[PDB]
Amino acid sequence: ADTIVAVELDTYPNTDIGDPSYPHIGIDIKSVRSKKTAKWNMQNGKVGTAHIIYNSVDKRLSAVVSYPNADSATVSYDVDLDNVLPEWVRVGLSASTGLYKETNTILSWSFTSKLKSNSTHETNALHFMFNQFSKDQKDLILQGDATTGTDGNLELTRVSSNGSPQGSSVGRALFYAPVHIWESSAVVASFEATFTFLIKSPDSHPADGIAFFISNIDSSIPSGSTGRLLGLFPDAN
Amino acid sequence: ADTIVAVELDTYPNTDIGDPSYPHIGIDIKSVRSKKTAKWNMQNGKVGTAHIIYNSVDKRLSAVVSYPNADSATVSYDVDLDNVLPEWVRVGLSASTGLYKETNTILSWSFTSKLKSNSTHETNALHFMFNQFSKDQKDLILQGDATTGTDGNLELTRVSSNGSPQGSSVGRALFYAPVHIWESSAVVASFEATFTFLIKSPDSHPADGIAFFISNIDSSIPSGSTGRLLGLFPDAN
Amino acid sequence: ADTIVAVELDTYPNTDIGDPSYPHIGIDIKSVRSKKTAKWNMQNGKVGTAHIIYNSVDKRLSAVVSYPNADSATVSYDVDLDNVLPEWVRVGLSASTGLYKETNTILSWSFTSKLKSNSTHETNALHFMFNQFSKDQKDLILQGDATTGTDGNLELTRVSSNGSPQGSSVGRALFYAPVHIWESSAVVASFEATFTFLIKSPDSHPADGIAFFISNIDSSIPSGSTGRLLGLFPDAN
Amino acid sequence: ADTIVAVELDTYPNTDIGDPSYPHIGIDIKSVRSKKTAKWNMQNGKVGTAHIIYNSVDKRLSAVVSYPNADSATVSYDVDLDNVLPEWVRVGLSASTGLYKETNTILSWSFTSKLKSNSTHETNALHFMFNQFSKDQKDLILQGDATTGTDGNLELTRVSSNGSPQGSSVGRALFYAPVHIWESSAVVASFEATFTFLIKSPDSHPADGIAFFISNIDSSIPSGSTGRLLGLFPDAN
Ligand SMILES: CO[C@H]1O[C@H](CO)[C@@H](O)[C@H](O)[C@@H]1O
Ligand SMILES: CO[C@H]1O[C@H](CO)[C@@H](O)[C@H](O)[C@@H]1O
Ligand SMILES: [Ca+2]
Ligand SMILES: [Ca+2]
Ligand SMILES: [Ca+2]
Ligand SMILES: [Ca+2]
Ligand SMILES: [Mn+2]
Ligand SMILES: [Mn+2]
Ligand SMILES: [Mn+2]
Ligand SMILES: [Mn+2]
């Protein structure tokens, strides 16, 4: 199986599997059952922003999600990524819908990674910023129903030509190049991620959510991982 | 008086005011009596690196100092800078010598600051990087005995033409422009600082140390702040 | 007098001093009589973008102004800034109105400067990005009628509370810290500037324009430099 | 065949095919016969730096190579990359040796790319910086004799364990992710590349050289492209 570390923007409460009984953001370490969550007052139809940060000194993964003029939800968790992820990984965005749906539109996404090694100003860095997604985005690996082009945005889950979301959908987008997330002889390693999203739900409740994730290089969507599994996990264990 | 927050690379143990009995790095919040320290195996004559980081989500100030192929000293401390520093500040480097001395040479210094406000991708940033210091460095405010030019380096404390350090010296270098370190309506604020130094001590023990600090805009060297006071504090309270 | 190098977004044709007979962008070297201009199809009421670039290898100052889905105006000019500007300067934005007016609103502004000196990876850099202007913006020097705060934007020229522009107005905003624009022993020096603006003209013709400029550190608005002079030049020579 | 645009640091004069009769840097557009060259006083055994720049406004490709305290060679050439390369490409470094040899060691390599599209602050960027090359560098595609690890450096051509260069060698290193070098609806596109190298020649004359290149995504070393062809071209046409 794959190794996943993720920050979920969970819109649908699947209390049977651990979700609190309200929209929330959480930190998932190899399991859809978040190690820690925070209430999130999701706003249907409004553009929002997520900020994820981490550094090997504090060994603390934190995320902040917010909407213009509104309280922001925050969540942090102590975790040493050296003990969880392989040295090389791929970063990406994932979303899904089940019985209930929503649009999982990504307007922009940026990522920065730095590795300071045992030497004088010897830093390795990787940075990419997407504000516009073209039809043939060769530096993105699209999996499942994810597509680009429609208004220059990234649609993680399927959306009909009229613009309405589809249920039972799952999509992901990973940056093409592998990222060196940590190293034995690293003095300091850190990364920062940001993305703006538009979750619009016409029907009853919105579902199922969007997630920023880090995984093994050769990761792919687990079968039947639509709905509650957010296109990240094979089961709800 | 001034408001100081500093990370000190203390080379001389003044146990009579709280210093551990050995070279150490510490975090000073308005007092030379560190709120927290960590043992530092300073290496006479070798070039070292310091990394200081902070973000408003974790409200945790951390620092890492190291030398090539050698264990690195680390220290962290929970502190909300909103409650301690004014909204606008100046950032700088400080050093001193007392009865015993050392060179407090700075080979490079970089700083990055970011403020994410309540809006879509509305970030304000400031970044500067010095690898070479010229004789007439107009974007630096030099105080006390600090000078630039000698090999394109920054000498915080006085050094004779032959190259030997002087005792009873105090110097500082602050970036010219004020930095917006935090704001009431900020979603995320963070800064990162790095500098490489060369502490060389000919005589007995090395003293007194170097420090990265943040202060009120109009800060200047307190009288008699040579020695143990590191050019930052008026007294040892 | 001051030494000015500027890229003007000239909205009012002052043909008797050399302006082409239509809105244009031009490059001014110590004179409001542009060394080179390009027709600019200015769009009243719409937000636009300006990009200014320069590097010491090509010794070529270029600018591009554009609006979403619209042709963009471009202008370039060969000029070695070493022979025109002092080694240290300040960068800023300037605007004015005369008999006719317009709003000269700045929504964001970023600047990057790099100096590569005679050494291994010895680069000095300066970077700032403003997307939000606060009421007490301490890192900006405001001159004339320039103010910040109204929607978090920068108003270069006077605007009444109801939102209508005033005539006979002149304003400027300069970054606080001096910028090292070039150095005798520099291998490569370069800068890049970007700002989005909103020029709205209720009355007859729009006037007078906005400009990005580089000047001697102690520059201030020349008396009577409203109107055609764009708050940059003492006269029309 | 492949589409190549390259800046060559040519150490061996193959006057038979157009080379000036001395070391030189040149700009190659789909042919080893440089469209333009500049004399280069290459220095055996010393670490040097190369800076390549380009922007779609001036449509000018420039390069600067230099050594500490020494004159630097410069070369520029007007060329619209839109008319020569695919929209998507890969960037890399190439080197070779023939009868005569040299080490083609890369100490560091950084690259920055930006695409400003028809919208408000809608920039796409890619940036990577290598100062240390590890044994298993997964984000680099190594072709031919290129290897990493030896002192954390990148050896483009073969080097015996004792440290001496081999003749008849060819190697390349390309960044893993495709780069979006230009787009029909782009307001401004630009890139910047930098790398420090160490060319050491024990024998007679040094040969054959190093080159920074941009090519179609699926590019590979042309057969028999050792020596004068710098691992870039199939023949000397
Ligand atoms: C012996 O005490 C003196 O010297 C030490 C070391 O230099 C300083 O810390 C102190 O303030 C005094 O000046
Ligand atoms: C003498 O000719 C050979 O050597 C030179 C220099 O090494 C190469 O340029 C050439 O292609 C051949 O291999
Ligand atoms: Ca759920
Ligand atoms: Ca002490
Ligand atoms: Ca005019
Ligand atoms: Ca040759
Ligand atoms: Mn959940
Ligand atoms: Mn101490
Ligand atoms: Mn004009
Ligand atoms: Mn050649």
> Could you tell me how far CA D185 lies from the centroid of its own chain?
28
**Ligand with smallest separation from the Cα of C7:** 9
Cα separation, B214 vs B199, whole angstroms: 22
Q: Domains in chain D: how many in total?
A: 1
Contact B25, B8 (CB under 8 A): yes
Contact B96, B106 (CB under 8 A): no
Pocket test for ligand 2, best of D228, D230, D233, D235 (most atoms within 8 A of CB): D228
- Structure tokens belonging to residue B96: 């001193």
Q: Is B237 annotated as a binding residue?
A: no
Q: Which atom of ligand 1 is nearest to the CA of B228?
A: 9
Which residue has the least CA distance to atom 1 on ligand 1? B99
Half-sphere exposure of C141 (CA within 13 A, CB side): 15
* Helix, strand, coil abundance in chain A, percent, nearest 5: 5, 45, 50
List the one residue out of D61, D110, C212 whose CA is nearest residue A127: D110
Please, which residues bridge with residue A215 across strands? Answer: A4, A90
Contact B97, B168 (CB under 8 A): yes
- What contacts B13, CB < 8 A, 6 or more positions away? B19, B20, B21, B22, B23, B24
Output the 3-class SS for C173-223.
EEECCCEECCCCCEEEEEEEEEEEEECCCCCCCCCCEEEEEEEECCCCCCC
Contact across the interface for B62 and A57, Cβ inside 8 Å: yes
Cα separation, B98 vs B229, whole angstroms: 9
Contact C98, C207 (CB under 8 A): yes
Q: Kindly report the number of other CB atoms within 10 A of residue B124's CB atom.
A: 24
Cα separation, B95 vs B170, whole angstroms: 6
Q: How far is the CA of B72 from the centre of ligand 8 (A)?
A: 18
List the one residue out of C168, C213, C220 whose CA is nearest residue C195: C213
Phi, psi torsion values for B178, nearest 5 degrees = -70, 150
- Which DSSP symbol is given to A16? G
- Structure tokens belonging to residue D83: 């008319």
Phi, psi torsion values for D120, nearest 5 degrees = -75, 120
- Tokens 């073969």 correspond to D158
Contact C52, C192 (CB under 8 A): yes
Mark out chain A residues that contact chain B at CB-CB < 8 A: 47, 49, 51, 53, 55, 57-58, 60, 62, 64, 66, 68-70, 72, 74, 76, 108, 116, 118-121, 187-188, 190, 194, 196
List the one residue out of D42, D13, D146, D38 whose CA is nearest residue D92: D146
Judge if the beta carbon of residue D228 lies within 6 A of ligand 2.
yes
Q: Kindly report the number of other CB atoms within 10 A of residue A33's CB atom.
A: 16
User: Omega before D80 cis (within 30°)?
Assistant: no
- A50 in helix, strand or coil? strand
Q: What are the DSSP calls for A184-206, one per residue?
A: TTEEEEEEEEEEEEE----SSS-
- Structure tokens belonging to residue B103: 């060179």
> Could you tell me how far CA D226 lies from the centroid of its own chain?
15
Q: Considering Cα of A142, then A146, then A150, then A151, what sign does the dihedral take?
A: negative
- Which DSSP symbol is given to B88? E
Please, which residues bridge with residue C172 across strands? Answer: C94, C143
* Residue of D25, D46, D49 to mutate when probing chain C, most C C-beta within 10 A: D49
Cα separation, D59 vs D55, whole angstroms: 6
Contact B124, B117 (CB under 8 A): yes
Which residue has the least CA distance to atom 9 on ligand 1? B228
Contact A33, A236 (CB under 8 A): yes
Contact A171, A105 (CB under 8 A): no
Helix (H) or strand (E) holding A170: strand A170-175
Which chain A residue has the Cα nearest residue B49? A120
List the one residue out of D113, D231, B216, B110 whose CA is nearest residue A121: B110
- Resolution for this model in angstroms, one decimal place? 2.8
- Structure tokens belonging to residue A77: 């968790």
Contact across the interface for D72 and C187, Cβ inside 8 Å: yes
Judge if the beta carbon of residue B208 lies within 6 A of ligand 1.
yes
List the one residue out of C7, A125, A64, A127 whose CA is nearest residue D123: A127
Q: Which atom of ligand 2 is nearest to the CA of D207?
A: 7
Contact B106, B197 (CB under 8 A): yes
Mark out chain A residues that contact chain D at CB-CB < 8 A: 88, 117, 119, 121-132, 134, 136, 138-139, 152, 175-180, 183, 217
Residue C184 one-letter amino acid: S
- Structure tokens belonging to residue D51: 């800076």
- B105 in helix, strand or coil? strand
Contact C39, C22 (CB under 8 A): yes
Q: How far is B92 from chain A (nearest CA, A)?
A: 19
Q: How far is CA B117 from CA A54, A193, B192, C108, in A?
A: 20, 16, 18, 13
Classify strands B105-117 and B123-130 as parallel, antiparallel or unpaired: antiparallel
User: Omega before D203 cis (within 30°)?
Assistant: no
Cα separation, C6 vs D71, whole angstroms: 31
Q: Kindly report the number of other CB atoms within 10 A of residue A237's CB atom.
A: 9
Q: How far is B121 from chain C (nearest CA, A)?
A: 8
Residue C152 one-letter amino acid: G
Cα separation, A74 vs B56, whole angstroms: 11
Judge if the beta carbon of residue D14 lies within 6 A of ligand 2.
yes
D127 exposure class (CB count in 10 Å sphere: 0-12, 13-18, 19+): middle
Provide the residue count of chain C.
237
Cα separation, A188 vs A117, whole angstroms: 7
Classify strands C154-155 and B4-10 as parallel, antiparallel or unpaired: unpaired
Chain B residues within an 8 Å CB radius of A53:
55, 57, 190
Q: What are the DSSP calls for chain C, one per residue?
A: ---EEEEEEE-S--GGGT--SS-EEEEEESSSS-SEEEE----TT-EEEEEEEEETTTTEEEEEEE-SSS--EEEEEE--GGGTS-SEEEEEEEEE-SSS----EEEEEEEEEEEEESSTT-EEEEEEEESS--TT-TTEEEEET-EE-GGG-EESS-B-TTS-B-SS-EEEEEESS-EE---TTEEEEEEEEEEEEE----SSS--SEEEEEEEETT--PPTT--GGGTTT-SS--
Q: Which atom of ligand 2 is nearest to the CA of D14?
A: 9
Contact across the interface for A139 and D180, Cβ inside 8 Å: yes
**Per-residue b/e over B20-30, b at no fewer than 16 CB within 10 Å?**
eeebbbbbbbb
Q: How far is CA A181 from CA A68, A81, A189, D74, in A?
A: 31, 8, 7, 37
- Structure tokens belonging to residue D187: 């307001």
Contact D130, D109 (CB under 8 A): yes
Q: Considering Cα of A179, then A169, then A233, then A224, what sign does the dihedral take?
A: negative
Residue A125 one-letter amino acid: A
- Structure tokens belonging to residue C19: 């302006």
> Could you tell me how far CA C55 lies from the centroid of its own chain?
18
Phi, psi torsion values for B124, nearest 5 degrees = -110, 130
- B17 in helix, strand or coil? helix
Cα separation, D230 vs A1, whole angstroms: 44
Output the 3-class SS for chain D.
CCCEEEEEEECCCCHHHCCCCCCEEEEEECCCCCCEEEECCCCCCCEEEEEEEEECCCCEEEEEEECCCCCCEEEEEECCHHHCCCCEEEEEEEEECCCCCCCCEEEEEEEEEEEEECCCCCEEEEEEEECCCCCCCCCEEEEECCEECHHHCEECCCECCCCCECCCCEEEEEECCCEECCCCCEEEEEEEEEEEEECCCCCCCCCCEEEEEEEECCCCCCCCCCHHHCCCCCCCC
Phi, psi torsion values for D7, nearest 5 degrees = -115, 115
Q: Kindly report the number of other CB atoms within 10 A of residue D2's CB atom.
A: 16
Contact B61, B54 (CB under 8 A): yes
Q: How far is D18 from chain A (nearest CA, A)?
A: 37
Q: How far is the CA of C25 from the centre of ligand 9 (A)?
A: 7
Classify strands B170-175 and B140-144 as parallel, antiparallel or unpaired: antiparallel
Annotated binding site of D: 8, 10, 12, 14, 19, 24, 99-100, 208, 228
Q: How far is C149 from chain D (nearest CA, A)?
A: 21
Cα separation, B129 vs B150, whole angstroms: 18
Q: Is B77 annotated as a binding residue?
A: no
Contact B99, B195 (CB under 8 A): no
Q: Could you tell me the CATH number of the domain that includes residue B20? A: 2.60.120.200
Helix (H) or strand (E) holding B94: strand B88-96
- Domain range for A18: 1-237
Contact B8, B211 (CB under 8 A): yes
C216 exposure class (CB count in 10 Å sphere: 0-12, 13-18, 19+): middle
Cα separation, D34 vs A202, whole angstroms: 60
Chain A residues within an 8 Å CB radius of D131:
117, 119, 121-124
Which residue has the least CA distance to atom 10 on ligand 1? B227
Contact A218, A117 (CB under 8 A): no
